Design a protein around this ligand. Sequence first.
Ligand SMILES: [K+]
Ligand SMILES: [K+]
Ligand SMILES: [K+]
Ligand SMILES: [K+]
Ligand SMILES: [K+]
Lengths: 223, 225, 234, 231
Amino acid sequence: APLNAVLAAPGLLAVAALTIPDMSGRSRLALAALLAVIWGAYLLQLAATLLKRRAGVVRDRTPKIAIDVLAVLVPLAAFLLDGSPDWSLYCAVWLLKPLRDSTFFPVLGRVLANEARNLIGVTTLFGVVLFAVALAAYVIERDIQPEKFGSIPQAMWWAVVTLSTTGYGDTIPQSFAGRVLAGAVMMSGIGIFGLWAGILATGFYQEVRRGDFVRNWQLVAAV
Amino acid sequence: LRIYAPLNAVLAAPGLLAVAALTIPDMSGRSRLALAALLAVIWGAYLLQLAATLLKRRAGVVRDRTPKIAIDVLAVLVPLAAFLLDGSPDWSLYCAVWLLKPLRDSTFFPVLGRVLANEARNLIGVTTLFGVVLFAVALAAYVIERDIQPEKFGSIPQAMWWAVVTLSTTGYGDTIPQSFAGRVLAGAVMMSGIGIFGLWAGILATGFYQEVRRGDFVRNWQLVA
Amino acid sequence: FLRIYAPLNAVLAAPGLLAVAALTIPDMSGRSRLALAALLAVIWGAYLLQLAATLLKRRAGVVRDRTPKIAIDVLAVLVPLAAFLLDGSPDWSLYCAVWLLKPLRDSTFFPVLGRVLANEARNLIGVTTLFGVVLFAVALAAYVIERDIQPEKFGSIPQAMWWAVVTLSTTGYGDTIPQSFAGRVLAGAVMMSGIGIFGLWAGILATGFYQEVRRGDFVRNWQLVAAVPLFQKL
Amino acid sequence: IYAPLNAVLAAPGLLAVAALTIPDMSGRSRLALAALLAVIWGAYLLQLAATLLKRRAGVVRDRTPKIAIDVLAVLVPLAAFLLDGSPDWSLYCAVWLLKPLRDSTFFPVLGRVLANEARNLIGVTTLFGVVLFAVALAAYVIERDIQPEKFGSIPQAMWWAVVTLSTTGYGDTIPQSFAGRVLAGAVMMSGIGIFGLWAGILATGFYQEVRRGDFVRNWQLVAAVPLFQKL
Ligand SMILES: [K+]
Ligand SMILES: [K+]
Ligand SMILES: [K+]
Ligand SMILES: [K+]
Ligand SMILES: [K+]
């Protein structure tokens, strides 16, 4: 079923493989050629999408066209303009190709729209708490660790890395007061970590029960 | 899309970043002034916003907005207090009273308040559930490796650190069990980390489901009678 | 909110547990250390007073069910006393930790949670066994790949199972890290299936707490809205 | 409950596979674990007979994989005991990982969840695959010059991309530059959303199964009429 998506797979990997140092000159050329063949295939797929007028009935596909155009113009612009061996990174527009044919995204679009209001209200909440924490983390250990928690942005780095529970461990609080704070930061992380899921889940629900207005109320109680 | 809708919150964005930029060591005195100026311009802008809210007492018949005003009031009194009373280069930190500014004009926290009140009983119980599991794990973490790592697991509050770290799955990697039985425990602790991440998610999912259930008195009881 | 108006017996537990922590700190002054030991005995006295409070008045009405409540109150005085007598080393106060069950008493969360971890238990213990399988199955591949590269981090299944939990749970300490190419590719798949297994737990519980308030409509608009005539007479 | 008798046996069986691979082990106790493996292997051989032999439940019932698991539990371990000559044969007995899967009454229901929502799930995989590569691209661009060995290639940047976006956060490949660390800030945030995406999708996955089993206690038992429904 997915014709466009399969072609991107070795294409994206070809962009990766071209960036590796100490690669042989003969094999490096082959990876460049594999980029070209797929480009032509995407050029051909542009022609099938563009040249199908006076033969196509009413079908909404405004974003579908955009992907097919970008997939051929960008890798062409770098093909002509960028003379440095760092031209292949432009081919990373083919990431839009697996986003074309999957019924996942037009549904996702109605989730991030019905619950859009609530979602951005969490992001700014994430920022506020992150900042509020990065502030106190600075006041507590600006003296003891002078190059780690030196500035608010140097504490913000830790505020991100603790609230997100990524947890690198390049900037850890040393003071008692600074550690017990980190505790609360590590906890308030979990709280919003699931709050995403909570909101995101309820969005999907109503779309499943919107089609239940014509499958349980007018397809078993009207016929 | 949202350039003239969150008018009050746009101003806070450069403001908070200015507070941040001011504390950076090795900053030139000329640029350090510019940032100090930028704070004041925004402070005056909120003073202008305070007047537009306070002097205009036009409501109509019935209108309640006491929490809305309380934010604007704090956004001018506190920075001014730091401008006068505090005499160290560490006065700018007080401007972070504008963290309350984005919380004003957004229809989400009156909704969140009703989620956090109708499932309060359940939420509160997860936190004391967390604290118990944390303390019990640290207790066990102590007894095992107090005699192997005396400066990492030497006390309960030294293990409580590893508990918070491991349970939340933040996992810093400064305190790590070395002995067999210590690590086996770490496993159950890390796994029990996943448990709590679920209950936090599941309950909030149940609370937000209860918000869609408010429309069963105007769409399934008055339109299906 | 049941925090500053309702749970009286759980408030007492707060300083109690912290005193257990405080008493274990090395380099502590024997003057303040005695004061901490003193605080425990005030609380243990308050719990002993609470024991009689729920043992004097044994009934209020006709028949009331409170078997688990007393089981907590009893353990709250017997175990701490057992350590105060039988154990005569500096390591005794640890037994005061049996006050961790005291917040689990005066809460409405746990009888709710109970019916959730029973109506869906079948699926929940199915996730743990899915975790076990994926944890070991991956750990097996880890040892095979990097036993000839880092023979002290990936030289035994137990060393690999360590990396298995550490990664799959998205803890990720950072002392065991795959060095080879092949290991890092799989390592990613561990972090990815780590997203599933971290969300599958969220899945069951989004159904559990849901399937509880949806049991008030089983006799309000289902078994009492549509019925046949002459159903209950004799 | 003493009902999963087939799974209890698996527990020490698999642990023995582990214990065998530990270096600095005495030959006396190394033989002892190899012995324990045989004991359980024979128990599954007895169980294999108890599956293929006795028959008394149904007309012609479908349980092909339930037998197939017991098939692999005895053909594979015996192949290692014979065909493999190195002390590294026990690794094959790991096939007993399939044993706790036989009758767990969680995996037949999970299959339908990963079918009625599979369309969506395989959507998030290539969504992850996109952002992962999208981020790695930028990481390389931002710090290929500064850290030429941690971010000296797209593969090396991809290593950070999984590590950050899965919130794992090892702490080996870390962006040092301002921009990369600002990016890392988002790469940590958008990972949390993905940690909700699956968690939200599977929150619907288990939903539209518990309300389909109550299509026989609220749709086919509440709305009942004799001689009024046929096809
Ligand atoms: K970590
Ligand atoms: K780390
Ligand atoms: K995590
Ligand atoms: K982590
Ligand atoms: K580290």
